């Protein structure tokens, strides 16, 4: 069917939907299911037992937040079906899923059962004309408009580094670590309890993510800022109460660059970028260092590019040019890539038709992926 394809980013934190024609995603809402915290027997309470996106944000304190997708993998599929149904609601897009074809953006090196079940839902529950699963990293390059480039895509659920040179992705050089934005939000909650402010509730976890997003700066030297006495910058909560964050502000997102501090066995965001380049062939190393692209929401931390440049330089070889080319629209970069890809006439060949999936089998989605 010729009618405009619907791009949808499967972001663990925030799913971004919209049409391929639009330069930006019109409808982007948080990826969580909202049910009433108190188990509702009586009338005059929150009805439906389902609150998604803007409806949830309004009555947030009353509801109990449950993320359906963890570490770029779908844990509860029933929840994810309701989320994708809300994408084709009167609230967002307001269209038939049966008419328009779909593009998914699954993280690299995900389970094959995750891709197979994702297709089954979108072909059976929704009567889609055609579906195409793609890598988040490959899209990010289409948006910026360069063929060569390493893509350090720090999402909410997963942070992954994929090196692609002249439209060729080395699949062995891909590096994936689970320590992402959501873990930084979890570790900030621990440090906030060490400052003396508890956020025990699942609703109260959402305002820790807001505190992180508002006020958390990455110091170039962490040891000097610790010895220096903090200003203790006040943050205002939804109720109106003030909280002085203090040293927790800067030593929370540090755990990205040094995850051994809390006690998580991972490489680190500076390390995975360098290791991904060093794993690739010697001839390409210089060009891959010379073309690095930051993607996702967990790069927007104040002074992230400043710290990463410094942490990469000392690990990388001496007298090598390191350009970390961040776009202005890092959060919405992954979708814009899909929107451009979808618009091209080549995409018509790439996607798998509904009749193709019935005849060919299950492999059809996997083999056409690349």
């Amino acid at each position: 069917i010729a009618n405009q394809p619907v791009v949808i980013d499967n972001g663990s934190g925030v799913i971004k939907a919209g049409f391929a024609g639009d330069q930006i995603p019109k409808y982007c809402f948080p990826n969580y299911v909202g049910r009433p915290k108190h188990v509702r027997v009586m009338a005059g309470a929150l009805e439906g037992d389902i609150f998604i996106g803007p409806k949830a944000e309004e009555h947030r304190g009353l509801l109990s937040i449950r993320y359906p997708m963890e570490h770029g993998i779908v844990k509860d599929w029933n929840d994810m079906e309701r989320i994708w149904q809300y994408v084709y609601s009167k609230d967002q897009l307001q269209t038939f899923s049966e008419e328009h074809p779909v593009l998914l953006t699954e993280a690299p090196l995900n389970p094959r059962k995750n891709r197979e079940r994702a297709a089954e839902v979108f072909f059976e529950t929704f009567n889609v004309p055609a579906l195409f699963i793609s890598m988040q990293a490959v899209l990010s390059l289409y948006a910026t408009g360069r063929t060569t480039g390493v893509v350090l895509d720090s999402g909410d659920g997963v942070t992954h580094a994929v090196p692609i040179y002249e439209g060729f992705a080395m699949p062995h050089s891909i590096m994936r670590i689970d320590i992402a934005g959501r873990d930084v939000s979890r570790f900030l909650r621990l440090y906030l309890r060490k400052e003396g402010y508890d956020f025990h509730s699942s609703s109260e976890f959402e305002i820790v993510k807001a505190i992180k997003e508002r006020a958390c700066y990455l110091s170039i030297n962490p040891q000097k800022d610790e010895t220096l006495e903090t200003e203790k910058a006040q943050y205002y909560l939804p109720d109106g109460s003030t909280i002085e964050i203090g040293p927790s502000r800067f030593r929370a997102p540090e755990l990205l660059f040094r995850p051994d501090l809390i006690g998580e066995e991972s490489e680190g965001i500076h390390e995975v970028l360098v290791f991904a380049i060093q794993k690739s062939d010697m001839d390409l190393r210089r060009t891959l260092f010379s073309n690095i692209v930051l993607s996702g929401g967990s790069t927007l931390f104040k002074g992230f590019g400043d710290r990463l440049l410094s942490e990469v330089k000392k690990l990388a070889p001496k007298d090598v040019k390191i350009r970390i080319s961040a776009p202005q629209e890092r959060l919405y970069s992954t979708w814009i890539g899909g929107s451009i890809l979808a618009s091209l006439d080549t995409f018509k060949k790439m996607w798998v038709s509904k009749k193709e999936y019935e005849e060919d089998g299950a492999r059809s989605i996997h083999r056409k992926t690349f």
Binding site: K37, V39, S64, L190, Y191, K194, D198, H200, R251
Partner: protein, 379 residues
């Protein structure tokens, strides 16, 4: 060398005594009776000005070191037991009081969970700490606390005391002694915390899982006609002499259920062990599960350990925990001292080790030089 003193500053009660003893010498409510104030102010209070906190701790430590313990503070060392993720400014103040005013030789800031493990003798064990403020859990594997897989919920003494006060005010039946033989509701606007605590301990008990699960659905009244078990007999409690409060049988076995209630989120005192254990490393699972430790005075409540261990094994079969923690054998450790004084006993056992104490502990000469207490946060 002299036998080092052990102090354990809590919101409800403080444990005090000397190292290498069977239990604590003095255990008292963590308050101070200041002139003018009718009700005594609580000594540990998080999120206040440092100068006001300094004065309260100076007043309290003085009472511990002279009226309760009889020993010179400057002469012998200190082993300060405090829970992990204790507020930064509070711990900084407590040390600054001991080092500046009292001029103690050296303080050792031991985490309560690692101390509780020493008392049993086992090197690795899961430790739940159901205290006053928050019921915290922290897996300890072969001497190393795993901060990565922490867990805390506000389902302790404070949350239970508040729940009791609410229920009593609804079904309020007091005999004032002024033509008040007939049921008189809410004669007093608020009930003092000292009374509520005494009612909780004597009257209220923890129900069986089978009876408790019925009580949860009963008070909910989820499309059912009077589906509650038969309650215990109503106990009459004296308030301030003449006033006799008749405590309803339902309140006794329903007040506790707020701890073990699911409340949609799936966040109980029971769930917190399994939520933490599932997040732990794959190799450590079977060792931690087999070695459970239940400290804190909230777990002293009669029939708490049976309900918890039962509620665990029920929540195991639930589909979320069924995959990972399905075929696991959960066995509880019985510590030598009572559930309240497990934390203290560890510090005393550690305090008896004079050789290791001096090395690990922070000396006054170091603090006066630097002015930087070591913590699990960055240096």
């Amino acid at each position: 060398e002299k036998t080092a003193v052990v102090i354990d500053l809590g919101e409800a009660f403080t444990k005090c005594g000397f190292a290498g003893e069977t239990g604590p010498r003095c255990i008292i409510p963590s308050v101070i009776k200041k002139a003018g104030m009718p009700k005594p102010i609580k000594v540990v209070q998080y999120n206040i000005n440092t100068e006001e906190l300094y004065s309260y701790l100076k007043e309290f430590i003085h009472i511990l070191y002279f009226r309760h313990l009889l020993v010179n503070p400057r002469d012998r060392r200190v082993v300060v037991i405090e829970s992990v993720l204790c507020p930064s400014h509070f711990r900084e103040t407590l040390t600054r009081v001991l080092f500046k005013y009292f001029e103690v030789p050296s303080v050792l800031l031991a985490p309560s969970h690692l101390m509780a493990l020493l008392t049993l003798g086992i090197n690795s064990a899961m430790v739940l700490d159901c205290g006053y403020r928050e019921s915290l859990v922290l897996p300890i594997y072969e001497g190393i606390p795993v901060l990565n897989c922490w867990g805390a919920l506000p389902l302790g003494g404070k949350a239970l005391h508040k729940e009791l006060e609410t229920q009593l005010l609804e079904q309020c039946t007091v005999d004032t002694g002024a033509a008040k033989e007939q049921s008189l509701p809410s004669v007093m606007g608020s009930i003092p915390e000292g009374v509520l605590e005494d009612i909780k301990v004597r009257t209220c008990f923890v129900s069986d899982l089978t009876r408790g699960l019925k009580i949860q659905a009963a008070k909910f009244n989820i499309d059912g006609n009077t589906e509650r078990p038969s309650p215990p007999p109503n106990v009459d409690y004296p308030l301030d002499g003449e006033k006799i409060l008749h405590v309803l049988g339902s309140i006794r076995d329903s007040v506790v259920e707020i701890l073990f209630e699911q409340d949609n989120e799936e966040k109980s005192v029971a769930t917190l062990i399994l939520d933490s254990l599932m997040q732990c490393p794959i190799d450590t699972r079977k060792q931690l599960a087999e070695n459970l430790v239940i400290i804190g005075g909230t777990s002293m409540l009669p029939g708490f350990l049976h309900r918890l261990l039962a509620e665990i094994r029920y929540l195991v079969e639930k589909p979320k925990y069924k995959k990972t923690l399905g075929t696991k054998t959960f066995r509880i450790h019985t510590p030598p001292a009572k559930a309240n004084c497990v934390a203290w006993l560890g510090g005393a056992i550690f305090g008896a080790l004079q050789d290791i104490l001096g090395s690990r502990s922070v000396s006054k000469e170091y603090y006066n030089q630097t002015g930087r207490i070591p913590d699990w946060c960055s240096l």
